Amino acid sequence: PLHPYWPQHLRLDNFVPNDRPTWHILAGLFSVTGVLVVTTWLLSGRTWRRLSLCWFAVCGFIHLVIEGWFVLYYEDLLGDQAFLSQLWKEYAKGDSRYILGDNFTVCMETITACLWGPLSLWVVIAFLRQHPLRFILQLVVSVGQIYGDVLYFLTEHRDGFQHGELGHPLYFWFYFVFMNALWLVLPGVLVLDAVKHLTHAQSTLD
Amino acid sequence: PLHPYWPQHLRLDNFVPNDRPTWHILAGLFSVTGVLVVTTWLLSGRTWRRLSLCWFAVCGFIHLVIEGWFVLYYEDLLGDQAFLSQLWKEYAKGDSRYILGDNFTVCMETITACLWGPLSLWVVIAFLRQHPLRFILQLVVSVGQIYGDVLYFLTEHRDGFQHGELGHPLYFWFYFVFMNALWLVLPGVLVLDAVKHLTHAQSTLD
Ligand SMILES: CCN(CC)CCO[C@H]1CC[C@@]2(C)C(=CC[C@@H]3[C@@H]2CC[C@]2(C)C(=O)CC[C@@H]32)C1
Ligand SMILES: CCN(CC)CCO[C@H]1CC[C@@]2(C)C(=CC[C@@H]3[C@@H]2CC[C@]2(C)C(=O)CC[C@@H]32)C1
């Protein structure tokens, strides 16, 4: 095959295999995410909700930098761009169609980068002073994430999983199903959390 | 041309124009919506927030009946079905591609039928103080509606408004821009409402 993307009849000109190996991307992401998690842990310290703050920092980073990189630089598809573009080519080696610049993928991603990145960072920043809007922002960001991800799954399901090889453990099960299921489940828990707290605050008013 | 739908290269066999004229559909929906608004006003009696309740009842009605009708019967869309199917063909004469059964559109519509419809009825029920959840549900539903509508507009914009004639007063400006813009403007205002109240309720933390 000329390319690993599973709709193998795709004739992808301007396609260049990336010079940096995947372990480069893994090391870079692990290090940067560790730095963010540690720094946010310290800022929160100076119990679980501090972990949620670290989660929101990671989310803001992913939405703003990575997904923003996708929204800005499709369809470039040349590994001469940073390990962000190399990362996107690897994930597109996974199930989803991040090479074609699909209308929905670009639109959904632009919304999450422009809004949920900034709003997640606002969740963590304004959470450090226990501000009334905090549970509202946590709920809004988690609803937007759950909604975008549900549309993501629904669209690729009705498309018959055309994009990306089916059943594959790494590319389909870990990349497509698991991580996205994280953005389904974890903000779901956060939704339940924020709802319980906002309900308690609302019940007091009499 | 054999059909009025504007991607004029569309070769739509199995297309049958419905025998009922557009005034049939417009009168039917206008009357049923009047019935709903009046009955909901009476139920609220038994100021502005009562109008918001009537709005949410109308929203639940549209999401459940009309958009679920589309979600179930977006495949055949032959006017030999009730004035709902002809209603969808009439709207599809406008910009959007509700005849092709676009992969993205149905998915989005499914969500609004399955979630924002029932949740709107829960909003109107819970507003008579049956639960603190009334404002939370209002915020969740309005955020979801705004997200669906923004994705709708963005997706049709990147497509260059291919679907549906540009500039057309009735089909583009009234159907596509104006009506949908309601689900842009009104729930946005409603979000502000809940925020003002929810922030004040969260202000209770002392
Ligand atoms: C969050 C938005 N959702 C839809 C809502 C789209 C998915 O966003 C992806 C963003 C990149 C990233 C983290 C993904 C999982 C596996 C990672 C991949 C980055 C590159 C990695 C590190 C490798 O070299 C092997 C494992 C790969 C998730
Ligand atoms: C919020 C969801 N958004 C997508 C994000 C889709 C909006 O749902 C559509 C539901 C049918 C309806 C109301 C539409 C505009 C013009 C209406 C049309 C129905 C038939 C009408 C009444 C006529 O006979 C003349 C005016 C026509 C809006």
Short mmCIF file of C-alpha atoms and ligand atoms in Angstrom, two decimals:
data_model
loop_
_atom_site.label_atom_id
_atom_site.label_comp_id
_atom_site.label_asym_id
_atom_site.label_seq_id
_atom_site.Cartn_x
_atom_site.Cartn_y
_atom_site.Cartn_z
CA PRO A 1 0.00 0.00 0.00
CA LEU A 2 1.08 3.60 -0.56
CA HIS A 3 -0.48 4.69 2.75
CA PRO A 4 -1.75 2.82 5.84
CA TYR A 5 -5.13 4.58 6.01
CA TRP A 6 -7.64 1.84 5.66
CA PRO A 7 -9.92 3.10 2.85
CA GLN A 8 -6.98 1.76 0.88
CA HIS A 9 -8.29 2.84 -2.52
CA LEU A 10 -7.70 6.42 -1.36
CA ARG A 11 -5.21 8.09 -3.71
CA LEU A 12 -3.45 10.43 -1.28
CA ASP A 13 -1.01 12.57 -3.22
CA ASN A 14 1.17 15.02 -1.25
CA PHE A 15 1.56 12.18 1.28
CA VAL A 16 4.92 11.89 3.04
CA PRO A 17 5.68 9.34 5.79
CA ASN A 18 6.84 11.18 8.89
CA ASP A 19 10.56 11.33 9.66
CA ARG A 20 10.03 11.25 13.45
CA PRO A 21 9.02 7.83 14.83
CA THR A 22 5.90 7.39 16.94
CA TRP A 23 7.91 6.96 20.14
CA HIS A 24 9.09 10.55 19.64
CA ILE A 25 5.47 11.72 19.84
CA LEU A 26 4.75 9.45 22.80
CA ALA A 27 7.74 10.78 24.75
CA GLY A 28 6.92 14.41 23.96
CA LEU A 29 3.28 14.07 24.96
CA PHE A 30 4.07 12.15 28.15
CA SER A 31 6.62 14.77 29.22
CA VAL A 32 4.43 17.80 28.46
CA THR A 33 1.37 16.24 30.11
CA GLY A 34 3.47 15.37 33.16
CA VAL A 35 4.68 18.97 33.41
CA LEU A 36 1.10 20.26 33.19
CA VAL A 37 -0.27 17.76 35.72
CA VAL A 38 2.53 18.47 38.22
CA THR A 39 2.32 22.27 37.90
CA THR A 40 -1.48 22.26 38.26
CA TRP A 41 -1.22 19.86 41.22
CA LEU A 42 1.13 22.32 42.93
CA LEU A 43 -1.08 25.32 42.10
CA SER A 44 -4.12 23.53 43.52
CA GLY A 45 -2.24 22.53 46.67
CA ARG A 46 -0.92 26.05 47.28
CA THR A 47 -8.77 16.47 47.23
CA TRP A 48 -10.13 14.75 44.10
CA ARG A 49 -11.13 18.12 42.65
CA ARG A 50 -7.45 19.02 42.42
CA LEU A 51 -7.11 15.93 40.21
CA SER A 52 -10.09 17.23 38.22
CA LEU A 53 -8.21 20.53 37.85
CA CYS A 54 -5.24 18.60 36.46
CA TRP A 55 -7.67 16.87 34.08
CA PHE A 56 -9.08 20.21 32.93
CA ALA A 57 -5.56 21.53 32.33
CA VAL A 58 -4.78 18.48 30.19
CA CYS A 59 -8.07 19.02 28.34
CA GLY A 60 -7.35 22.69 27.69
CA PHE A 61 -3.92 21.77 26.36
CA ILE A 62 -5.27 19.07 24.03
CA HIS A 63 -8.17 21.18 22.72
CA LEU A 64 -6.13 24.38 22.27
CA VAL A 65 -2.72 23.22 21.02
CA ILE A 66 -3.30 19.85 19.32
CA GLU A 67 -6.86 20.14 18.00
CA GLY A 68 -6.23 23.80 17.22
CA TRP A 69 -3.22 22.66 15.21
CA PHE A 70 -5.53 20.34 13.27
CA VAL A 71 -8.11 23.08 12.67
CA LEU A 72 -5.41 25.44 11.37
CA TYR A 73 -3.21 23.12 9.30
CA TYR A 74 -5.37 20.81 7.23
CA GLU A 75 -4.87 19.57 4.70
CA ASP A 76 -1.09 19.88 4.89
CA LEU A 77 -0.24 16.23 5.57
CA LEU A 78 3.54 16.78 5.36
CA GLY A 79 5.64 15.50 8.24
CA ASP A 80 7.91 18.53 7.88
CA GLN A 81 5.57 20.15 10.40
CA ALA A 82 5.94 19.67 14.13
CA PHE A 83 5.28 16.57 16.20
CA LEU A 84 1.72 17.95 16.34
CA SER A 85 1.23 17.21 12.64
CA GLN A 86 3.11 13.92 13.09
CA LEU A 87 0.72 13.14 15.96
CA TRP A 88 -2.30 13.87 13.79
CA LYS A 89 -0.99 11.61 11.02
CA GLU A 90 -0.55 8.82 13.59
CA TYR A 91 -4.05 9.26 15.02
CA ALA A 92 -5.38 9.31 11.45
CA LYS A 93 -3.55 6.01 11.02
CA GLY A 94 -6.12 5.17 13.66
CA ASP A 95 -9.79 5.00 12.67
CA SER A 96 -10.90 8.58 12.07
CA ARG A 97 -10.61 10.70 8.91
CA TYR A 98 -8.27 13.47 10.06
CA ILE A 99 -6.44 13.52 6.70
CA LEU A 100 -9.38 14.48 4.48
CA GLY A 101 -10.45 17.48 6.54
CA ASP A 102 -14.04 16.21 6.85
CA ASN A 103 -16.61 18.98 7.26
CA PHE A 104 -17.89 17.71 10.61
CA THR A 105 -14.46 16.82 12.02
CA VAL A 106 -13.08 20.26 11.15
CA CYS A 107 -16.21 22.02 12.46
CA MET A 108 -16.46 20.00 15.69
CA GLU A 109 -12.73 20.41 16.26
CA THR A 110 -12.85 24.18 15.65
CA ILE A 111 -15.64 24.48 18.23
CA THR A 112 -13.75 22.41 20.81
CA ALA A 113 -10.46 24.25 20.24
CA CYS A 114 -11.93 27.76 20.21
CA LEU A 115 -14.27 27.16 23.18
CA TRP A 116 -13.56 24.08 25.30
CA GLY A 117 -9.83 24.79 25.50
CA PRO A 118 -10.22 28.32 26.83
CA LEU A 119 -13.24 27.30 28.91
CA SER A 120 -11.39 24.35 30.47
CA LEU A 121 -8.51 26.62 31.42
CA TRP A 122 -11.08 29.05 32.81
CA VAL A 123 -12.51 26.16 34.83
CA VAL A 124 -9.14 25.41 36.41
CA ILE A 125 -8.08 29.07 36.85
CA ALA A 126 -11.34 30.42 38.26
CA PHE A 127 -11.71 27.24 40.35
CA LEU A 128 -8.70 28.32 42.45
CA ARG A 129 -10.82 30.97 44.22
CA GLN A 130 -14.11 29.02 44.49
CA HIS A 131 -16.15 31.33 42.15
CA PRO A 132 -19.88 30.76 41.53
CA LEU A 133 -19.52 30.25 37.76
CA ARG A 134 -17.17 27.29 38.28
CA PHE A 135 -19.69 24.46 38.43
CA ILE A 136 -21.49 26.09 35.50
CA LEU A 137 -18.31 26.07 33.38
CA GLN A 138 -17.48 22.50 34.40
CA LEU A 139 -20.96 21.41 33.34
CA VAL A 140 -20.86 23.40 30.08
CA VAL A 141 -17.43 22.11 29.03
CA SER A 142 -18.32 18.53 29.94
CA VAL A 143 -21.62 18.72 28.04
CA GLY A 144 -19.84 20.12 24.98
CA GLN A 145 -17.21 17.39 25.16
CA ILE A 146 -19.80 14.62 25.59
CA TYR A 147 -21.91 16.03 22.74
CA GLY A 148 -19.00 16.39 20.33
CA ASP A 149 -17.77 12.89 21.11
CA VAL A 150 -21.24 11.33 20.78
CA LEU A 151 -21.57 12.99 17.37
CA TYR A 152 -18.07 11.72 16.55
CA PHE A 153 -19.04 8.10 17.28
CA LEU A 154 -22.47 8.40 15.64
CA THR A 155 -21.05 9.86 12.42
CA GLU A 156 -18.33 7.23 12.11
CA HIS A 157 -20.88 4.50 12.92
CA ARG A 158 -23.39 5.51 10.25
CA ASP A 159 -20.43 5.78 7.86
CA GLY A 160 -19.86 2.09 8.61
CA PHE A 161 -16.37 2.68 10.06
CA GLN A 162 -15.17 3.10 6.46
CA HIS A 163 -12.37 5.32 7.77
CA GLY A 164 -9.77 3.25 9.62
CA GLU A 165 -9.36 -0.52 9.84
CA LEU A 166 -12.06 -2.29 11.85
CA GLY A 167 -11.39 -4.42 14.91
CA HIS A 168 -7.71 -3.46 14.98
CA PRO A 169 -6.59 -3.40 18.64
CA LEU A 170 -4.26 -0.41 18.49
CA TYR A 171 -5.79 1.71 15.74
CA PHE A 172 -9.49 1.02 16.31
CA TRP A 173 -9.90 -0.24 19.88
CA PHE A 174 -7.35 1.90 21.73
CA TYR A 175 -7.22 5.03 19.53
CA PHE A 176 -10.84 5.32 18.43
CA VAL A 177 -12.89 3.62 21.15
CA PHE A 178 -10.95 3.94 24.43
CA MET A 179 -9.61 7.54 24.53
CA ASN A 180 -12.78 8.98 23.09
CA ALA A 181 -14.66 6.90 25.66
CA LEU A 182 -12.55 8.81 28.18
CA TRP A 183 -13.96 12.08 26.84
CA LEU A 184 -17.36 10.38 27.11
CA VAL A 185 -17.08 8.98 30.65
CA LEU A 186 -14.85 11.33 32.66
CA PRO A 187 -16.74 14.55 31.77
CA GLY A 188 -19.90 12.48 32.36
CA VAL A 189 -18.77 11.94 35.95
CA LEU A 190 -17.95 15.66 36.09
CA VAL A 191 -21.47 16.41 34.82
CA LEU A 192 -22.96 14.35 37.64
CA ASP A 193 -20.66 16.13 40.12
CA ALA A 194 -21.50 19.66 38.98
CA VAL A 195 -25.21 18.80 38.79
CA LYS A 196 -25.25 17.50 42.37
CA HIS A 197 -23.46 20.60 43.68
CA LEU A 198 -25.61 23.06 41.70
CA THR A 199 -28.77 21.25 42.85
CA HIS A 200 -27.62 21.51 46.46
CA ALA A 201 -26.93 25.23 46.07
CA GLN A 202 -30.30 25.79 44.36
CA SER A 203 -32.25 23.86 47.01
CA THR A 204 -30.99 26.22 49.73
CA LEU A 205 -32.76 29.25 48.24
CA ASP A 206 -36.12 29.53 50.01
CA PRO B 1 -35.61 20.78 -13.71
CA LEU B 2 -37.27 17.65 -12.30
CA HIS B 3 -36.94 18.70 -8.65
CA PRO B 4 -36.57 22.04 -6.85
CA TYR B 5 -33.69 20.98 -4.60
CA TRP B 6 -30.77 23.22 -5.47
CA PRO B 7 -27.73 20.97 -5.91
CA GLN B 8 -29.24 20.88 -9.38
CA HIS B 9 -27.05 17.97 -10.47
CA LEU B 10 -29.04 15.90 -7.97
CA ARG B 11 -30.68 13.06 -9.86
CA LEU B 12 -33.50 12.25 -7.45
CA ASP B 13 -35.55 9.41 -8.83
CA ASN B 14 -38.30 8.11 -6.54
CA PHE B 15 -39.18 11.78 -5.96
CA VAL B 16 -42.88 12.61 -5.73
CA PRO B 17 -44.08 16.18 -5.04
CA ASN B 18 -46.74 16.08 -2.35
CA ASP B 19 -50.31 16.97 -3.29
CA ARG B 20 -50.75 19.24 -0.26
CA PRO B 21 -49.73 22.87 -0.91
CA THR B 22 -47.37 24.69 1.42
CA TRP B 23 -50.21 26.59 3.10
CA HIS B 24 -51.50 23.24 4.40
CA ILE B 25 -48.24 22.64 6.28
CA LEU B 26 -47.83 26.24 7.44
CA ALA B 27 -51.41 26.48 8.72
CA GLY B 28 -51.19 23.12 10.46
CA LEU B 29 -47.98 23.91 12.32
CA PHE B 30 -49.00 27.49 13.13
CA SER B 31 -52.32 26.28 14.59
CA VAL B 32 -50.80 23.38 16.56
CA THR B 33 -48.07 25.69 17.92
CA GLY B 34 -50.75 28.19 18.95
CA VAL B 35 -52.64 25.41 20.74
CA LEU B 36 -49.45 24.37 22.54
CA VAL B 37 -48.50 27.92 23.57
CA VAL B 38 -52.01 28.68 24.85
CA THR B 39 -52.36 25.42 26.80
CA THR B 40 -48.89 25.88 28.32
CA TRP B 41 -49.79 29.44 29.32
CA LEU B 42 -52.85 28.05 31.11
CA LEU B 43 -50.72 25.36 32.79
CA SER B 44 -48.26 28.02 33.95
CA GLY B 45 -51.20 29.98 35.34
CA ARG B 46 -52.28 26.87 37.26
CA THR B 47 -44.03 36.54 33.82
CA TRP B 48 -41.26 36.15 31.24
CA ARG B 49 -40.38 32.73 32.68
CA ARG B 50 -43.89 31.55 31.79
CA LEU B 51 -43.05 32.53 28.21
CA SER B 52 -39.81 30.55 28.53
CA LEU B 53 -41.91 27.56 29.59
CA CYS B 54 -44.12 27.93 26.52
CA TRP B 55 -40.97 28.18 24.40
CA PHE B 56 -39.53 25.00 25.93
CA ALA B 57 -42.81 23.16 25.36
CA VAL B 58 -42.71 24.19 21.69
CA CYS B 59 -39.06 23.10 21.55
CA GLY B 60 -39.81 19.69 23.03
CA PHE B 61 -42.67 19.31 20.56
CA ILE B 62 -40.55 20.15 17.51
CA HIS B 63 -37.58 18.02 18.63
CA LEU B 64 -39.74 15.00 19.42
CA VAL B 65 -42.41 14.97 16.73
CA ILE B 66 -40.88 16.67 13.68
CA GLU B 67 -37.19 15.87 14.09
CA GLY B 68 -37.93 12.30 15.28
CA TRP B 69 -40.15 11.93 12.22
CA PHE B 70 -37.11 12.91 10.16
CA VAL B 71 -34.81 10.56 12.11
CA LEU B 72 -37.15 7.63 11.49
CA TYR B 73 -38.29 8.50 7.96
CA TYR B 74 -35.37 10.37 6.36
CA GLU B 75 -34.91 7.44 3.99
CA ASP B 76 -38.07 7.54 1.87
CA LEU B 77 -39.49 11.07 2.35
CA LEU B 78 -42.41 10.55 -0.03
CA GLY B 79 -45.35 12.87 0.46
CA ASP B 80 -47.68 9.89 0.63
CA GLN B 81 -46.79 10.11 4.33
CA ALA B 82 -48.40 12.71 6.60
CA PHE B 83 -47.77 16.45 6.28
CA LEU B 84 -44.67 15.87 8.44
CA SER B 85 -42.83 14.24 5.52
CA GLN B 86 -44.08 16.94 3.15
CA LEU B 87 -43.03 19.47 5.78
CA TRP B 88 -39.51 18.07 5.66
CA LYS B 89 -39.51 18.15 1.86
CA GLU B 90 -40.65 21.79 2.02
CA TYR B 91 -37.86 22.72 4.43
CA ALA B 92 -35.37 20.78 2.30
CA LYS B 93 -36.35 22.97 -0.64
CA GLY B 94 -34.56 25.50 1.56
CA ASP B 95 -30.82 25.26 2.03
CA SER B 96 -30.31 22.05 3.93
CA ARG B 97 -29.98 18.51 2.61
CA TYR B 98 -32.79 16.71 4.41
CA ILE B 99 -33.61 14.70 1.25
CA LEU B 100 -30.18 13.10 0.84
CA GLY B 101 -30.16 11.92 4.44
CA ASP B 102 -26.75 13.48 5.02
CA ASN B 103 -24.63 11.34 7.34
CA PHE B 104 -23.99 14.20 9.78
CA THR B 105 -27.46 15.78 9.77
CA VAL B 106 -29.40 12.65 10.78
CA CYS B 107 -26.96 11.99 13.61
CA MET B 108 -27.33 15.52 14.95
CA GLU B 109 -31.08 15.36 14.50
CA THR B 110 -31.20 12.02 16.31
CA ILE B 111 -29.59 13.58 19.36
CA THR B 112 -32.00 16.50 19.44
CA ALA B 113 -34.89 14.08 19.08
CA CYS B 114 -33.62 11.63 21.70
CA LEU B 115 -32.24 14.12 24.26
CA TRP B 116 -33.26 17.78 23.88
CA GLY B 117 -36.90 16.86 23.22
CA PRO B 118 -37.60 14.91 26.41
CA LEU B 119 -35.32 17.18 28.43
CA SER B 120 -37.33 20.23 27.33
CA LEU B 121 -40.52 18.65 28.67
CA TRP B 122 -38.62 17.90 31.88
CA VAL B 123 -37.61 21.59 31.95
CA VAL B 124 -41.21 22.79 31.68
CA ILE B 125 -42.37 20.25 34.30
CA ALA B 126 -39.58 21.05 36.78
CA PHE B 127 -40.03 24.84 36.49
CA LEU B 128 -43.08 24.89 38.80
CA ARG B 129 -40.42 24.33 41.51
CA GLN B 130 -40.80 20.54 41.43
CA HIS B 131 -36.99 20.29 41.53
CA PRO B 132 -33.92 22.52 41.92
CA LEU B 133 -32.90 20.94 38.58
CA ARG B 134 -35.06 23.35 36.55
CA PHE B 135 -32.32 25.90 35.83
CA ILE B 136 -29.66 23.21 35.36
CA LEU B 137 -31.85 21.46 32.79
CA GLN B 138 -32.55 24.78 31.06
CA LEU B 139 -28.80 25.45 30.82
CA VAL B 140 -27.98 21.95 29.56
CA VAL B 141 -30.70 21.97 26.89
CA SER B 142 -29.83 25.48 25.70
CA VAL B 143 -26.11 24.67 25.47
CA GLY B 144 -26.88 21.53 23.47
CA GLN B 145 -29.23 23.40 21.13
CA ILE B 146 -26.68 26.16 20.51
CA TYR B 147 -23.98 23.55 19.85
CA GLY B 148 -26.11 21.61 17.36
CA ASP B 149 -27.12 24.80 15.56
CA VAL B 150 -23.59 26.21 15.38
CA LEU B 151 -22.33 22.90 13.97
CA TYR B 152 -25.21 22.99 11.48
CA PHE B 153 -24.30 26.48 10.25
CA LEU B 154 -20.54 25.81 10.19
CA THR B 155 -20.97 22.56 8.25
CA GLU B 156 -23.23 24.15 5.65
CA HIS B 157 -20.85 27.12 5.41
CA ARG B 158 -17.71 25.09 4.70
CA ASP B 159 -19.75 23.30 2.01
CA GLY B 160 -20.20 26.70 0.38
CA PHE B 161 -23.99 26.58 0.89
CA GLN B 162 -24.05 24.04 -1.96
CA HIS B 163 -27.36 22.77 -0.63
CA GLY B 164 -30.11 25.30 -1.33
CA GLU B 165 -30.09 28.47 -3.43
CA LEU B 166 -28.05 31.32 -1.99
CA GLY B 167 -29.64 34.65 -1.20
CA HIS B 168 -33.16 33.30 -1.79
CA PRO B 169 -35.51 35.15 0.60
CA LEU B 170 -37.91 32.35 1.52
CA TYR B 171 -35.75 29.25 1.11
CA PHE B 172 -32.39 30.60 2.31
CA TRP B 173 -33.08 33.66 4.46
CA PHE B 174 -36.33 32.62 6.17
CA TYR B 175 -35.99 28.82 6.30
CA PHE B 176 -32.24 28.39 6.78
CA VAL B 177 -30.99 31.59 8.43
CA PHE B 178 -33.95 33.07 10.32
CA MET B 179 -35.79 30.08 11.80
CA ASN B 180 -32.65 28.23 12.83
CA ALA B 181 -31.27 31.51 14.20
CA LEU B 182 -34.02 31.31 16.82
CA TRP B 183 -32.33 28.24 18.31
CA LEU B 184 -29.21 30.42 18.22
CA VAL B 185 -30.57 33.54 19.93
CA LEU B 186 -33.32 32.49 22.35
CA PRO B 187 -31.52 29.65 24.22
CA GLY B 188 -28.42 31.85 24.37
CA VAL B 189 -30.45 34.44 26.25
CA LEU B 190 -31.84 31.56 28.29
CA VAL B 191 -28.31 30.45 29.15
CA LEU B 192 -27.65 33.92 30.53
CA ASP B 193 -30.83 33.59 32.57
CA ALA B 194 -29.78 30.34 34.20
CA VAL B 195 -26.26 31.67 34.71
CA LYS B 196 -27.50 34.79 36.48
CA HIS B 197 -29.68 32.63 38.70
CA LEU B 198 -27.22 29.76 39.12
CA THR B 199 -24.35 32.09 39.93
CA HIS B 200 -26.54 33.80 42.51
CA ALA B 201 -27.49 30.42 43.94
CA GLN B 202 -23.84 29.43 44.01
CA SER B 203 -23.19 32.80 45.67
CA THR B 204 -24.85 31.09 48.66
CA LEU B 205 -21.57 29.33 49.52
CA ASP B 206 -20.44 31.03 52.72
C1 LIG C 1 -10.08 14.46 22.42
C2 LIG C 1 -10.79 14.66 21.05
N1 LIG C 1 -11.17 13.35 20.46
C3 LIG C 1 -12.59 13.37 20.06
C4 LIG C 1 -13.49 14.03 21.14
C5 LIG C 1 -10.32 13.08 19.27
C6 LIG C 1 -9.06 12.26 19.70
O1 LIG C 1 -8.02 13.19 20.07
C7 LIG C 1 -6.72 12.54 20.14
C8 LIG C 1 -5.65 13.49 20.38
C9 LIG C 1 -4.31 12.78 20.24
C10 LIG C 1 -4.20 11.45 21.04
C11 LIG C 1 -3.80 11.82 22.49
C12 LIG C 1 -5.45 10.59 21.10
C13 LIG C 1 -5.30 9.07 21.78
C14 LIG C 1 -4.04 8.28 21.37
C15 LIG C 1 -2.69 9.25 21.19
C16 LIG C 1 -2.97 10.54 20.40
C17 LIG C 1 -1.71 11.36 20.30
C18 LIG C 1 -0.50 10.50 19.59
C19 LIG C 1 -0.26 9.27 20.29
C20 LIG C 1 0.27 9.68 21.69
C21 LIG C 1 0.86 8.13 19.72
O2 LIG C 1 1.84 8.31 19.07
C22 LIG C 1 0.22 6.61 20.32
C23 LIG C 1 -1.02 7.03 21.19
C24 LIG C 1 -1.55 8.44 20.54
C25 LIG C 1 -6.74 11.48 21.25
C1 LIG C 2 -33.21 23.67 15.57
C2 LIG C 2 -32.98 22.55 14.53
N1 LIG C 2 -32.64 23.12 13.21
C3 LIG C 2 -31.32 22.63 12.75
C4 LIG C 2 -30.19 23.03 13.73
C5 LIG C 2 -33.69 22.71 12.23
C6 LIG C 2 -34.97 23.55 12.50
O1 LIG C 2 -36.12 22.70 12.44
C7 LIG C 2 -37.00 22.99 11.31
C8 LIG C 2 -38.30 22.41 11.54
C9 LIG C 2 -39.28 22.73 10.43
C10 LIG C 2 -39.35 24.24 10.10
C11 LIG C 2 -40.06 24.95 11.28
C12 LIG C 2 -37.99 24.89 9.91
C13 LIG C 2 -37.93 26.40 9.16
C14 LIG C 2 -39.11 26.81 8.26
C15 LIG C 2 -40.53 25.98 8.57
C16 LIG C 2 -40.28 24.48 8.75
C17 LIG C 2 -41.56 23.68 8.86
C18 LIG C 2 -42.58 24.01 7.62
C19 LIG C 2 -42.86 25.42 7.56
C20 LIG C 2 -43.56 25.76 8.90
C21 LIG C 2 -43.88 26.08 6.37
O2 LIG C 2 -44.83 25.59 5.86
C22 LIG C 2 -43.19 27.67 6.10
C23 LIG C 2 -42.12 27.81 7.23
C24 LIG C 2 -41.57 26.28 7.48
C25 LIG C 2 -37.09 24.52 11.14
#
